[PDB]
Each structure stands twice: as structure tokens, then as C-alpha cells.
Tab-separated table of C-alpha atoms in Angstrom:
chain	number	residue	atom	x	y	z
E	4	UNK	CA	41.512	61.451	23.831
E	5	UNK	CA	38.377	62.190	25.967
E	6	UNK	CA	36.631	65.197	25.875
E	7	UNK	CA	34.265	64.511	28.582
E	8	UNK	CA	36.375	67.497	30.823
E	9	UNK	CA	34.750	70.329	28.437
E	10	UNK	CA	31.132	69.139	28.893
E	11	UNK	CA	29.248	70.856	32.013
E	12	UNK	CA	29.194	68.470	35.460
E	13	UNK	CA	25.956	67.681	36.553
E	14	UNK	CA	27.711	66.412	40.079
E	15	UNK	CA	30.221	64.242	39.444
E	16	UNK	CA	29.034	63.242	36.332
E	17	UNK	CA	29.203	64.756	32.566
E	18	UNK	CA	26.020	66.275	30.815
E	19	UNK	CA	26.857	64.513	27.890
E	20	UNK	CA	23.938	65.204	25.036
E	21	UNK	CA	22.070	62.096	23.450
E	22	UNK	CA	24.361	61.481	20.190
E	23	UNK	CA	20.887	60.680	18.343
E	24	UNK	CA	20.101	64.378	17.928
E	25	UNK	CA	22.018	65.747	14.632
E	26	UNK	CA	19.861	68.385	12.234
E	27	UNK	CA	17.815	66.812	9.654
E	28	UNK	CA	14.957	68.531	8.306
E	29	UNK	CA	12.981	69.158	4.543
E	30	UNK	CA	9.850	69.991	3.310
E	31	UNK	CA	7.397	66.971	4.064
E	32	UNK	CA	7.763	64.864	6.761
E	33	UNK	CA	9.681	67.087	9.126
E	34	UNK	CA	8.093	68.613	11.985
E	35	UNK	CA	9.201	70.529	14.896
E	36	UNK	CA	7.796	71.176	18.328
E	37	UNK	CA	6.572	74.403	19.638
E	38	UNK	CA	3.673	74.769	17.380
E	39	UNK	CA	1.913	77.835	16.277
E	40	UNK	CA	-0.610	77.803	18.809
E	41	UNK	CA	-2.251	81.169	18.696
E	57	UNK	CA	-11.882	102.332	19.001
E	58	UNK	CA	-13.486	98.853	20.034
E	59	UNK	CA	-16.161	98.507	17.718
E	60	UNK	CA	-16.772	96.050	21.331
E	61	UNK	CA	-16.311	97.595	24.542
E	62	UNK	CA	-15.742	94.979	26.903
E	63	UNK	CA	-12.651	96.143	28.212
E	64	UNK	CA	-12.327	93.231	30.450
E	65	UNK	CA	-11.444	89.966	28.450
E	66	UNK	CA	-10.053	92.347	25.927
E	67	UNK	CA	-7.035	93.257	27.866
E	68	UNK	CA	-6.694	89.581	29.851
E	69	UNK	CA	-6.800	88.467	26.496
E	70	UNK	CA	-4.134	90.916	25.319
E	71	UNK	CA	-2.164	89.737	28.322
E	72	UNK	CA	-2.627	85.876	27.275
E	73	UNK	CA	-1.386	86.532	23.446
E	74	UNK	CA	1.776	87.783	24.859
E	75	UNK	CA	3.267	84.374	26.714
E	76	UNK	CA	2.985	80.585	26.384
E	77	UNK	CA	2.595	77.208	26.899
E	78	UNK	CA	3.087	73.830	26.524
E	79	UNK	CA	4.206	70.321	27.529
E	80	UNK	CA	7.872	69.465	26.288
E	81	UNK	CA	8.760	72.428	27.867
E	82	UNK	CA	10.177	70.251	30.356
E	83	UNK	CA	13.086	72.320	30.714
E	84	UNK	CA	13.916	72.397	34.657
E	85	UNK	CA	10.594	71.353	36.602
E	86	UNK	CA	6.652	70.375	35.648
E	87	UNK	CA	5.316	70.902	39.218
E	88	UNK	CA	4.415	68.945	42.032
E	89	UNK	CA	2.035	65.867	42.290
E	90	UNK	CA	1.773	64.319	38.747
E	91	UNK	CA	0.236	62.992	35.816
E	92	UNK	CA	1.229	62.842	32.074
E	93	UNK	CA	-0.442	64.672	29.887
E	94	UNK	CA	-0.840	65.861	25.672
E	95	UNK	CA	0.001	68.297	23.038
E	96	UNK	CA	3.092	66.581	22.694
V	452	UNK	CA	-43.966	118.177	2.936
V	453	UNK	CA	-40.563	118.611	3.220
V	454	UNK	CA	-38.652	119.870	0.301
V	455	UNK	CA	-35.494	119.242	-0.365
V	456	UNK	CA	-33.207	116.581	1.671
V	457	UNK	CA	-34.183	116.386	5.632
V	458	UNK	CA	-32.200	118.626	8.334
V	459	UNK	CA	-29.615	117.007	10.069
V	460	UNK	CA	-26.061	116.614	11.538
V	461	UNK	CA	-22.513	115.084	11.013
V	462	UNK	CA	-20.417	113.912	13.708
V	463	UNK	CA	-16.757	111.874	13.117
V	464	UNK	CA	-17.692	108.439	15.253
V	465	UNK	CA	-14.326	106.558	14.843
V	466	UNK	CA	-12.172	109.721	15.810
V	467	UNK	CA	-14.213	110.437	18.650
V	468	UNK	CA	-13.801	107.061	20.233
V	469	UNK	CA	-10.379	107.412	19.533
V	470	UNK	CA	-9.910	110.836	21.217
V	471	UNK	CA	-11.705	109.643	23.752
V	472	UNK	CA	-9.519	106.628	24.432
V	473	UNK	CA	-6.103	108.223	24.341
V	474	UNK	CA	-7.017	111.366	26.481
V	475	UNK	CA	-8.301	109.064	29.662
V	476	UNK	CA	-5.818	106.885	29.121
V	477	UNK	CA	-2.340	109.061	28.238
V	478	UNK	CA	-3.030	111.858	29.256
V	479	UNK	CA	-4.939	111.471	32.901
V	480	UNK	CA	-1.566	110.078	33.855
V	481	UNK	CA	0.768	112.491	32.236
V	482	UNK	CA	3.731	113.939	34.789
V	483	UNK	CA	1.821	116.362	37.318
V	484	UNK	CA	4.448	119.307	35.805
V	485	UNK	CA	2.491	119.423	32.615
V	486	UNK	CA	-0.789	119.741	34.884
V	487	UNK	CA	-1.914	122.877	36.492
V	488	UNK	CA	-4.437	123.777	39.114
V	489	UNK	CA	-8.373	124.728	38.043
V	490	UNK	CA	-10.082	128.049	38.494
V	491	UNK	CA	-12.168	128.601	41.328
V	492	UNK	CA	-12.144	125.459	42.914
V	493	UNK	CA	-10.205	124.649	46.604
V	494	UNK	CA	-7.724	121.651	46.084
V	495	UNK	CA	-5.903	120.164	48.441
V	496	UNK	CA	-2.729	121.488	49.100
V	497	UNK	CA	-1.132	118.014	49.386
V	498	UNK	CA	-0.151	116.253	46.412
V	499	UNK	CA	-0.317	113.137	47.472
V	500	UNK	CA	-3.818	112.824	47.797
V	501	UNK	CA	-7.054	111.780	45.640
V	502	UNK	CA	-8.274	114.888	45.616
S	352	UNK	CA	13.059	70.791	72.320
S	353	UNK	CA	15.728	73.479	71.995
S	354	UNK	CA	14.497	77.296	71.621
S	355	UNK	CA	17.022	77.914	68.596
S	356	UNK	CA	14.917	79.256	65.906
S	357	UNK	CA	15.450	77.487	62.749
S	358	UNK	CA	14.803	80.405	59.929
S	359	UNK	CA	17.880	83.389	60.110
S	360	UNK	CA	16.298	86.099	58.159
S	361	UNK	CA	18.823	88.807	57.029
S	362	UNK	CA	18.099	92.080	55.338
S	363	UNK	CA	19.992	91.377	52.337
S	364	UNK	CA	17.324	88.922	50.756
S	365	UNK	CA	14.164	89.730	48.904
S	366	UNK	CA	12.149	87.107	49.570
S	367	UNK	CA	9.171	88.916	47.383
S	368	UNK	CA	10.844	89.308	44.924
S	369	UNK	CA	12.296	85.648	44.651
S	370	UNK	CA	9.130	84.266	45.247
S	371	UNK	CA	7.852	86.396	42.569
S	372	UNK	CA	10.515	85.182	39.801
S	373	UNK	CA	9.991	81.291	40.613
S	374	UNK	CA	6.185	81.733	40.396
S	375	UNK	CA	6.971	82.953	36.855
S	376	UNK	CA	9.690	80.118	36.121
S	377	UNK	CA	7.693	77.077	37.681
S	378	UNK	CA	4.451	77.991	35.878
S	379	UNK	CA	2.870	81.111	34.289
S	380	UNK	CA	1.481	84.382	35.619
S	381	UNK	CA	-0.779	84.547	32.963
S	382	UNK	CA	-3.466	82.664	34.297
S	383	UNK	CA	-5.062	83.757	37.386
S	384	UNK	CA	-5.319	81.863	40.519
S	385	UNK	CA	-7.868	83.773	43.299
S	386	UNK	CA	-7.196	81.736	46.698
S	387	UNK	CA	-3.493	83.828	46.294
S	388	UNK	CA	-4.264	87.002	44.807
S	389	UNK	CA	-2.459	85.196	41.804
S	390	UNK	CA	-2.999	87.977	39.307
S	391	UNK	CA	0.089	89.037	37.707
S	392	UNK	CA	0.172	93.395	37.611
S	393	UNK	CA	-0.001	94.347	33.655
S	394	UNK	CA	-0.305	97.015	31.459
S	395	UNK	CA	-2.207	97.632	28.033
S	396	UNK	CA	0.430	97.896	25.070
S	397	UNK	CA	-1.712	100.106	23.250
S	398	UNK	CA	-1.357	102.821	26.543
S	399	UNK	CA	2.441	102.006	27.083
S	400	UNK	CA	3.126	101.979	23.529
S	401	UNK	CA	1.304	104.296	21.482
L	853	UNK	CA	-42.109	84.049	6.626
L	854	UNK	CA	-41.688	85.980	3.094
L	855	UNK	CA	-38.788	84.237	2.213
L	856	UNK	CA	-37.676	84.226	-1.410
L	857	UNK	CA	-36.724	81.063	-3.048
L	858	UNK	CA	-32.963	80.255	-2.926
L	859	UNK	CA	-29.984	78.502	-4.525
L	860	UNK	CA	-26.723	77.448	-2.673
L	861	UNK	CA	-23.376	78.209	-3.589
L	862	UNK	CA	-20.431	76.909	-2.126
L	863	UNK	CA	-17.050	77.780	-1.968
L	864	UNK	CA	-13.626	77.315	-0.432
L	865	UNK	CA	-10.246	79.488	0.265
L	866	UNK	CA	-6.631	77.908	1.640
L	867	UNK	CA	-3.922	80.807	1.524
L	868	UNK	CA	-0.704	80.824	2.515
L	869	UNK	CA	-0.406	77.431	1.329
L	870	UNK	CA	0.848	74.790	-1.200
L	871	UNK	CA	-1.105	71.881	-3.001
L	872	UNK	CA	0.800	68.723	-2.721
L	873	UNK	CA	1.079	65.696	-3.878
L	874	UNK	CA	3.698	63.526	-2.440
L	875	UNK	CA	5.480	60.829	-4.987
L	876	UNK	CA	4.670	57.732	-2.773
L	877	UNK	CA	2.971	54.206	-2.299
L	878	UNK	CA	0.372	55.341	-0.782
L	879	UNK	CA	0.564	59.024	-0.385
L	880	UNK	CA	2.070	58.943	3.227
L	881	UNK	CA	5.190	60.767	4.321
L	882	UNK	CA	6.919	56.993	4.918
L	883	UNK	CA	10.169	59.455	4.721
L	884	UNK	CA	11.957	61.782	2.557
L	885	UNK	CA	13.102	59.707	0.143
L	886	UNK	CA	9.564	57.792	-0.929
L	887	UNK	CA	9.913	54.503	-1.704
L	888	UNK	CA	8.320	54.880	-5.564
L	889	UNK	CA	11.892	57.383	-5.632
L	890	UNK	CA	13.998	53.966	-4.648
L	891	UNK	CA	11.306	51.962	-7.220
L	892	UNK	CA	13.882	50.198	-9.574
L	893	UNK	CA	11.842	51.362	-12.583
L	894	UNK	CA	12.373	54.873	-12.040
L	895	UNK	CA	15.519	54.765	-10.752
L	896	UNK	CA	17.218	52.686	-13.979
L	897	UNK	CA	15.144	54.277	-16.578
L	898	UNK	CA	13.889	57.145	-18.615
L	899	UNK	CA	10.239	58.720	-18.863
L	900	UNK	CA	8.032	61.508	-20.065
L	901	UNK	CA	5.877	63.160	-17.935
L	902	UNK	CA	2.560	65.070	-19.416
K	6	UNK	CA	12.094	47.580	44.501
K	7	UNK	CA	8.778	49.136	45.492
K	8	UNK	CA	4.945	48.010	45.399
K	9	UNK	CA	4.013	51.536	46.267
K	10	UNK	CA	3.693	52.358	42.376
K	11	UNK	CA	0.748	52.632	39.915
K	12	UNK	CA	1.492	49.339	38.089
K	13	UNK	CA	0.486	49.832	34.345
K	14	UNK	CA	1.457	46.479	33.370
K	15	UNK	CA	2.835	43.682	35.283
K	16	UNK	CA	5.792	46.012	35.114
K	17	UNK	CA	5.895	48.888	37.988
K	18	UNK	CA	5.823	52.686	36.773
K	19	UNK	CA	8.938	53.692	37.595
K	20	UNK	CA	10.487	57.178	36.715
K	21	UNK	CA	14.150	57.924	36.337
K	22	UNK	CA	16.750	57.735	39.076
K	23	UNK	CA	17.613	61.017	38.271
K	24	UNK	CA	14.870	63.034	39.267
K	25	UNK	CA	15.694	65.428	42.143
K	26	UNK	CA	15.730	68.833	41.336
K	27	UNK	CA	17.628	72.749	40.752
K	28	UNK	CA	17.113	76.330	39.140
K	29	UNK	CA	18.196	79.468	40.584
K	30	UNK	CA	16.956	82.558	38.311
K	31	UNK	CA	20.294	83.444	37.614
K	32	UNK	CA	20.054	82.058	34.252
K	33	UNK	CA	21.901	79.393	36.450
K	34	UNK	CA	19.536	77.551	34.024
K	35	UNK	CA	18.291	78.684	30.598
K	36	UNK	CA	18.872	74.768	30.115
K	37	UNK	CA	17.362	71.955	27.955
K	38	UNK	CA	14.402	69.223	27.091
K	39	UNK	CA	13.314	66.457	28.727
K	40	UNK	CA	13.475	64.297	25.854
């Protein structure tokens, strides 16, 4: 009775998931990552539309899924 | 004197910035097809070019 | 040493195009980077989408 | 330099949003179930509240 | 061991063994946190 044979293989190893992580949420108290964070009356044209570009994307630092970058330091917004 | 209110003239601001907007920017780039050729005016024969 | 060249490009791969998809992954296009041109091509959705 | 004499008002909005006040020692989020929930008294008792 | 790291504390700075890394756009990932 093992059911490590139905978990992906990292390489000769199973990705078995931290069994600390099971749903548990209500109204105060519980907080969850990935925060909100965000005819021109003003012709600028420029900023407008690199701004327009910047409200449609994102980022952050737990978003440590697959690879930070490089040379390294740890940073915030945790 | 003048009698009466003063002389003057009306002009739609917000739908003439919008006009504006949308025909540069729709429909300078529609399909060439819906575009024809001016009046009295040489233009290159090649489509492909600026001009 | 030995004249075998080491990089055996076929005509099957994109490199571009690759390169282009793990720029976006690794970090994010948004931002613009001038020493390589690193300025992501976009559109205004108020032209594409009217 | 012909200003008028004045009077201040002030005045604050918060939409989109609910007042609370949490039913604990001292007012922290210590968990969901506060500890003045747990406190014997009003766990083996009866109250009114006004 | 290694005396080539920043040493915060007596103790070395030391990440995790497994740290080498894979992703291949296929979706090959689409995969999880840190944490």
C-alpha cells in the first residue's frame, strides 16, 4: 500500500507534495498570496500605451515557479 | 453696444477627438481592397511601397 | 585542437523564436531593457479591440 | 492676497468595505477561534448583549 | 563543506541540494511554488 508510483518522478525520485498544505481559510486572519497589486483629455500617447502594456501582466516574488534568474539575492513583497 | 447675446460658434469637442482617433488609427490600416487610388495624382504602380 | 565544430545547426529549429518564449518565461517583456533592443512588439487594445 | 477668511472641514470615505471588530484579547487576529471565544465564561454561560 | 559562502551566522548560507535546473515551453512545466 504505497502510492508513491502515481506521483510524477522528478529523476528517480517522487514529487511528493508537503502534507502541511490542506485548505483552510475564513474571514479574518486568512490571507493569500498574489495580492491585488494594481479622447485623452491628456495626450501623451507615450506612457499612456507602455502603461496600458504594464496593466496587462505581472509580477512578483513567490512566483518561484521554475527559475528566479542568475546571480542572486533575496528579496520582498513576500 | 451690442444687443442681444454675442455672435459665435458651436463645435462637438469630445466627438471630434474621437473621430479623429479612430479614423488614423482603424481606418489608415484598413485592407488596401476597401482603398482606392486619388484623382489626379501619379502613384506608384507598386504596392509595396511608401508611396 | 580538433577542427570539429561543436554547434550542428539544422533547419528544423527556431532558435528566434525559442529564445523569444524563454525571455518571456524567465522574466517579463514588459519592462524594457535598451543594450538588447529588449522591447517587446505590442498593440493598443483600444485599436485591436474597438 | 485677497483671500477670504476660511473654516476647515474634514471628511473621510472607505467603500467596498466592512467595519470590524474582532472578539479578542487584544484585538489581534491570534486565530480564528479568539481566545475570549474559548474564555470559560462565555463558553459555560448565558448573556445579553445591548 | 565549503568556506566559499556568505556566512550569516557562524552557520554557512547554504541553499538546497536540489537546485539545478529545467523548463521547456511545452507546458513541460506549468508547475508549482517554491515554498
Amino acid at each position: 500500500i504505497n502510492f508513491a508510483s502515481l506521483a510524477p518522478r522528478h529523476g528517480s525520485r517522487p514529487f511528493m507534495g508537503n502534507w502541511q498544505d490542506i485548505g483552510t481559510s475564513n474571514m479574518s486572519g486568512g490571507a493569500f498570496s498574489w495580492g491585488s497589486l494594481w479622447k485623452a483629455w491628456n495626450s501623451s500617447t507615450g506612457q499612456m500605451l507602455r502603461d496600458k502594456l504594464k496593466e496587462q501582466n505581472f509580477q512578483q516574488k513567490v512566483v518561484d515557479g521554475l527559475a528566479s534568474g542568475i546571480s542572486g539575492v533575496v528579496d520582498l513583497a513576500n | 453696444i451690442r444687443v442681444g447675446n454675442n455672435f459665435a460658434m458651436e463645435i462637438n469637442l469630445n466627438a471630434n477627438l474621437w473621430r479623429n482617433f479612430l479614423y488614423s488609427n482603424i481606418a489608415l490600416y484598413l485592407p488596401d481592397k476597401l482603398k482606392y487610388s486619388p484623382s489626379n495624382v501619379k502613384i506608384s504602380d507598386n504596392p509595396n511601397t511608401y508611396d | 585542437a580538433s577542427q570539429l565544430n561543436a554547434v550542428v545547426d539544422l533547419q528544423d529549429r527556431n532558435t528566434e523564436l525559442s529564445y523569444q518564449l524563454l525571455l518571456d518565461s524567465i522574466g517579463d517583456r514588459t519592462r524594457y531593457f535598451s543594450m538588447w533592443n529588449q522591447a517587446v512588439d505590442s498593440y493598443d487594445p483600444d485599436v485591436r479591440i474597438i | 492676497k485677497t483671500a477670504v477668511d476660511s473654516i476647515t472641514q474634514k471628511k473621510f470615505l472607505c467603500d467596498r468595505t466592512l467595519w470590524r471588530i474582532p472578539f479578542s484579547s487584544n484585538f489581534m487576529s491570534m486565530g480564528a477561534l479568539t481566545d475570549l471565544g474559548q474564555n470559560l465564561l462565555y463558553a459555560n454561560s448565558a448573556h445579553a448583549l445591548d
